[PDB]
Enzyme design. Structure first.
Site, PDB file in Angstrom:
ATOM      1  N   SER A   3      13.147  -3.837   7.950  1.00 12.99           N
ATOM      2  CA  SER A   3      12.709  -4.177   9.296  1.00 12.99           C
ATOM      3  C   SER A   3      11.399  -3.469   9.621  1.00 12.99           C
ATOM      4  O   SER A   3      11.223  -2.290   9.302  1.00 12.99           O
ATOM      5  CB  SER A   3      13.782  -3.799  10.314  1.00 12.99           C
ATOM      6  OG  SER A   3      15.061  -4.226   9.880  1.00 12.99           O
ATOM      7  N   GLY A  48       9.840   2.527  10.850  1.00 10.16           N
ATOM      8  CA  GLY A  48       8.695   2.936  10.057  1.00 10.16           C
ATOM      9  C   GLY A  48       9.073   3.493   8.701  1.00 10.16           C
ATOM     10  O   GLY A  48       8.309   3.365   7.740  1.00 10.16           O
ATOM     11  N   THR A  49      10.246   4.125   8.603  1.00  5.08           N
ATOM     12  CA  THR A  49      10.727   4.591   7.306  1.00  5.08           C
ATOM     13  C   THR A  49      10.999   3.413   6.377  1.00  5.08           C
ATOM     14  O   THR A  49      10.601   3.422   5.207  1.00  5.08           O
ATOM     15  CB  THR A  49      11.986   5.439   7.485  1.00  5.08           C
ATOM     16  OG1 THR A  49      11.698   6.551   8.344  1.00  5.08           O
ATOM     17  CG2 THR A  49      12.472   5.962   6.142  1.00  5.08           C
ATOM     18  N   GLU A  74       8.087 -23.713  -5.279  1.00  4.54           N
ATOM     19  CA  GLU A  74       7.955 -24.820  -4.340  1.00  4.54           C
ATOM     20  C   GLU A  74       7.690 -24.312  -2.930  1.00  4.54           C
ATOM     21  O   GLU A  74       6.825 -24.843  -2.223  1.00  4.54           O
ATOM     22  CB  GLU A  74       9.210 -25.691  -4.371  1.00  4.54           C
ATOM     23  CG  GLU A  74       9.029 -27.071  -3.768  1.00  4.54           C
ATOM     24  CD  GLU A  74       8.001 -27.897  -4.511  1.00  4.54           C
ATOM     25  OE1 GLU A  74       8.024 -27.888  -5.761  1.00  4.54           O
ATOM     26  OE2 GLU A  74       7.172 -28.554  -3.849  1.00  4.54           O
TER      27      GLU A  74
END
EC number: 3.6.5.-
Lengths: 427, 440, 440
Positions: free
Chosen positions: B141, B145-146, B255
């Site tokens: 995610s 930040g980690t 594709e």
């Protein structure tokens, strides 16, 4: 870095630390002897954080109680819950500090500083996962204001990487047993604003007001006030005590609650701070908890958020609540209180919900706010500074102790530097 | 081109992986023991799948190739208690004692680079055990930040190691309205420039849009992070549905890359999954293919807190599950062109990709799902992403004026120059994105 | 284009629509629960219906395409308690959060169009589900200003949207003697103003004349609102029977519009249905359709407080259901030519729009009227409604001059010119109906 040692000092802070351990073993489940009774594994990791695994499955609390008058630590040692206390935990001396900032550290602290640093070094050698200290003392007490400011400066000089966290109670400006009590508080905060990175404001008069409204008792009991600040401390450390939707460390909370190394002062707030039996009359709802956190008198710092200016706010909840519900609630209270809340951040909210709920409560909340009206709490003490020894009364005691006027002007300039930051950043 | 290496970075990334492996086991009906689960099928593995994500052993036990990297011991202990760790290998997972920082400071610093060499040989050893490779899958995610810092370090090392397979990165975007972490916009902006240099294809999914979906489509009173993880698992499985199960029109990972990456610098496709509704709404009346294709263009299914009508149409994809009539989606796609819902372009518009797979969609028991024999997963490239980019950039620029936190970043591993370069790079991506879209 | 969409607005509108669907499913032998029961059974399929109204979705249920809109939560709870809600869809039945006002001052305000935006996309979705439309059907009442307000506002929106389909608005007119709400005079005048804006065909019905029929013909001591809804369900069943069932003379709904609007402005034709007699009286009488036609011309079978004998003859529709003898209607048209009781006008004279339906009429067991195998429907234009509107206009003018309620209206968002133009328009409608009669 997950373990935290709860430091204890002050003639009244020892009861706060003792009540802290009592609520810890009462919340997660632990016997007075030391045998484990928690459930199931997440709490056992917390026993490794706050306690030490002794032999035969026994636990011992990792607390450093350093004060005077060993008759007090011996009386609380004979208590039922205080039976698992290790003899190396408490390091007490003789006999009394005389309720003065000088005799606390300048005269008696010079001979006990070497012993308390050897103890905290032995504790650091036994457990290397230490990340911060939790100190509970009295800013107005002689043992608290004297010994507390010395150990904090010693920890800051020797262990700068380790975090700092204190729960000092502020002396009442209206009532006081003596005029030297707030003076020792000013001489203490002169060094606390530089050697401490985090502190919590607790007012005894604010504690007296909340028990007159909720508890509805004429004479306030210090045992109940210890249990109240214990539930506050338990509700703050719940981010690491129990896993939730988003767990944050004390460093992650610090780097988001202050923009500068200053702003160590914090306004404390607990929920639900309701009366006995009022949970049946009024439904426990999250809008009600928000209204209690927005009340000026419900805070135990205590400051008026309306007269001040919201700098940084942080409300950590516990229990089963909806993420979108509290997001809409925090958005509504920020729009309707746009004059109070600062607008250039623009969102100065920082929430951390806990999964489990405290025993006996379906949902709880711990709110920490930063207002600009807190300068008035320092000004009244600063006014008492210029209104107590301006008559030069009892000054011969301080001159014999070795104190000079240079530290008094330094403490005054520190308060001037604080109120300047209070208006930098104007209200 | 038969294996896809998936990596779970960060706390939310590890939870998304566990939900992805759980749904992958639910579709094939795979239990913790297995041996396939059991060995009777054909086509639940083998044959493919599982042979793209689950590593085949001599005994036959499918080991899902996943590298759970995190510096928080609580999340690592949680994923090890469940049967997922028994499915994986104990050496594939990486353990950390102390979290990097809050949140991108140490996640991208040299302290997080100490494990870069360790996980690199782990991937090399994992690739040596298996045979072939199609791409690198990432699940981290952008809010953390980690996770964003470590995930970018893995992306840069894999680019300089092989550089032969397209690197996929599934990024979770925080809610643009409210942000819990004050450095969350800082971690996202600093990661966008890094993924710009490394990632060949990205994925933008918003948490608030997912929460609005399950509250309106699934009609749940209390949203949960497990529901978001299950919906992402349905999204990821719908992307690689053809690679796991054969269909009438099998599409490749190349594709999608030849359908979602159309420009020298364009690697930001939007995800849409329809139909998603409650079980009661399906009990009242069914839905036609035209209603589902029209539901793909709604702002709710776009999984982003922005309106797609203002965006300009670009090359898109639409994967179809189970039994799907070729003319029905052809009759629907011609009506969509005639409806002119999204503003069409003069250059791309003939780009509504139709992909069919025989595997019908599966509904998890935890999160509701519209029970339908055919599902649609729309991978669009509408120009509303720049609006989401400018939305988070204005809050980034508004904060950066005073930024309240620059002393911690310039001291640990960063400086004011890196924040300015990431700001100029993000503004350059928005300008190039508008110029290529508005020139029509 | 054969499909027909029905709208139910207001408390009386939902109750009329509920009895309409109750009689519909009762004729084709369909239970009010669903699936089916049963058929699509000889010939409940083709010729439609039941597929024009009871559309068969992919789920296999013959759902009636009806939109139940009302700002009163009590009426929404009433229609939800019945089994037709399970037949319907929660998106078809729009729930009302709060009542606007008492009852039209805020219903036609911005609060009305706020809900109109929600029901419009539902109509667009309903149009995408079932393509084709023959005419817009409306069911509301003038006593309820919310029903007359939201129904007329939606009527004006769809006429500006398509304008190509017919508009059949069923409006319940209150009696000139009773005023259950002193607000209804302003609502009726403002409703006639909105019909001057857009109106294809409006049906007038008085509850006083219906309740008088149940007391006299049906021998009912206290006529209930359910019997009135069932009677309106019967008159609308015979009208749409030309499209549902087969017949030698099939009449189109647009053909009905080209049979009801002779003059450049005709929006209000009166209705009449017969025979409506008692159960024991139906067993004692076995008259042919000739006596039924003679009884339909009488004001007793008009279900309205208007005398067709006093008013002048105009364009009228003669619909027949069941076994119809062409000589019997030949004798009927012979006798009406021999009557010469009404003014035999010069533009109309040889017009009684023939309607033949092979399906025998069917009545509900709750209704006191026995199921008769023959029915005649005379839908005529009469100048008596111009006299009725004049009486309503006189009461409205007296209350408007007293301005006792205008102060509360201008606070709701009304203006003096709005009531003035509504009065000028209503006076023009009565004057127009007087002209088309006096021109004979």
């Amino acid at each position: 870095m997950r373990e935290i040692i709860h430091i204890s000092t002050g003639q009244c802070g020892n009861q706060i630390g003792a009540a802290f351990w009592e609520t810890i073993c009462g919340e997660h489940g632990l016997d007075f002897n030391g045998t484990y009774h928690g459930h199931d594994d997440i709490q056992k990791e917390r026993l490794n954080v706050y306690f030490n695994e002794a032999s035969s499955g026994k636990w011992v609390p990792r607390s450093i109680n350093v004060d005077l008058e060993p008759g007090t630590i011996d009386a609380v040692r004979n208590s039922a819950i205080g039976n698992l206390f290790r003899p190396d935990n408490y390091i007490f001396g003789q006999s009394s500090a005389g309720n003065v900032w000088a005799k606390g550290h300048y005269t008696e602290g010079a001979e006990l500083v070497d012993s308390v640093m050897d103890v905290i070094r032995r504790e650091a050698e036994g457990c290397d996962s230490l990340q911060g200290f939790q100190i509970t003392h009295s800013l107005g007490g002689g043992t608290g204001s004297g010994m507390g400011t010395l150990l904090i400066s010693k920890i800051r000089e020797e262990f700068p990487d380790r975090m700092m966290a204190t729960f000092s109670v502020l002396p009442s400006p209206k009532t006081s047993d003596t005029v030297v009590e707030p003076y020792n508080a000013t001489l203490s905060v002169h060094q606390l604003v530089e050697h401490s990175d985090e502190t919590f404001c607790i007012d005894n008069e604010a504690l007296y007001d909340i028990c007159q409204r909720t508890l509805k008792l004429n004479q306030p009991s210090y045992g109940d006030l210890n249990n109240l600040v214990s539930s506050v401390m338990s509700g703050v450390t719940t981010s690491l005590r129990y896993p939730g939707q988003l767990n944050s460390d004390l460093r992650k909370l610090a780097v988001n609650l202050v923009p500068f190394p200053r702003l160590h002062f914090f306004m404390v707030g607990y929920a639900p701070l309701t009366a006995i039996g009022s949970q049946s009359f009024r439904s426990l709802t999250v809008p009600e908890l928000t209204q209690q956190m927005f009340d000026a008198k419900n805070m135990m710092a205590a400051a008026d958020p309306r007269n001040g200016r919201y700098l940084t706010v942080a409300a950590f909840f516990r229990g089963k609540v909806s993420v979108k519900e509290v997001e809409d609630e925090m958005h509504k209270v920020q729009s309707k209180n746009s004059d109070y809340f600062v607008e250039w951040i623009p969102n100065n909210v920082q929430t951390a919900v806990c999964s489990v709920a405290p025993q006996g409560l379906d949902m709880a909340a711990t709110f920490i706010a930063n207002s600009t009206s807190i300068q008035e709490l320092f000004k009244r003490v600063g006014d008492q500074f210029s209104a107590m020894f301006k008559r030069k009364a009892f000054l011969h005691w301080y001159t014999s102790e070795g104190m000079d006027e240079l530290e008094f002007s330094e403490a005054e300039s520190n308060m001037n530097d604080l109120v300047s930051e209070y208006q930098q950043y104007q209200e | 081109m038969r294996e896809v290496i998936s990596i779970n970075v960060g706390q939310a990334g590890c939870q998304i992986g566990n939900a992805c492996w759980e749904l992958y086991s639910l579709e094939h009906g795979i239990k913790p023991d297995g041996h396939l689960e059991d060995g009777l099928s054909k086509p639940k593995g083998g044959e493919e799948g599982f042979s793209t994500f689950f590593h085949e052993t001599g005994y036959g036990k499918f080991v899902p190739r996943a590298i759970y990297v995190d510096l928080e011991p609580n999340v690592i202990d949680e994923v090890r208690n469940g049967p997922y760790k028994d499915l994986f290998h104990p050496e594939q997972l990486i353990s950390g004692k102390e979290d990097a920082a809050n949140n991108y400071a140490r996640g991208h610093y040299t302290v997080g680079r100490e494990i870069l060499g360790d996980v690199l040989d782990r991937i090399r050893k994992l690739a040596d055990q298996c045979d072939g490779l199609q791409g690198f899958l990432f699940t981290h995610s952008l809010g953390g930040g980690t996770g964003s810092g470590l995930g970018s370090l893995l992306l840069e090392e894999l680019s300089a190691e092989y550089g032969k397979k397209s690197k996929l990165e599934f990024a979770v975007y925080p809610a643009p309205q409210v942000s819990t972490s004050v450095v969350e916009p800082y971690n996202t902006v600093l990661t966008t420039h890094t993924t710009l240099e490394h990632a060949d294809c990205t994925f933008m999914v918003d948490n608030e849009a997912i929460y609005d979906m399950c509250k309106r489509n699934l009609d749940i009173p209390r949203p949960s992070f497990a529901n978001l993880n299950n919906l992402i698992a349905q999204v990821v499985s719908s992307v690689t549905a053809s690679l796991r199960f054969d269909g009438s029109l099998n599409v490749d990972l190349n594709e999608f890359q030849t359908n979602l990456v159309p420009y020298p610098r364009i690697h930001f496709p939007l995800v849409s999954y329809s139909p998603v509704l409650s079980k009661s709404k399906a009990f009242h009346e069914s839905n036609s293919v035209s209603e589902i294709t029209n539901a793909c263009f709604e702002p709710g299914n776009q999984m982003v807190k922005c309106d797609p009508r203002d965006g300009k149409y670009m090359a898109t994809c639409l994967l179809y599950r189970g039994d799907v009539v070729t003319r029905d989606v052809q009759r629907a796609v011609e009506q969509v062109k005639n409806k002119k819902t999204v503003q069409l372009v003069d250059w791309c518009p003939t780009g509504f990709k139709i992909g069919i797979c025989y595997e019908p969609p599966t509904a998890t028991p935890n999160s509701q799902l519209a029970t339908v024999d055919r599902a649609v997963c729309m991978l669009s490239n509408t120009t509303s992403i720049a609006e989401a980019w400018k939305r988070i950039d204005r809050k980034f620029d508004l904060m950066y004026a005073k930024r309240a936190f620059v002393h911690w970043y310039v001291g640990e591993g960063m400086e004011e120059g890196e924040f300015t370069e990431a700001r100029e790079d993000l503004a350059a991506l928005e300008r190039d994105y508008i110029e290529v879209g508005a020139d029509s």
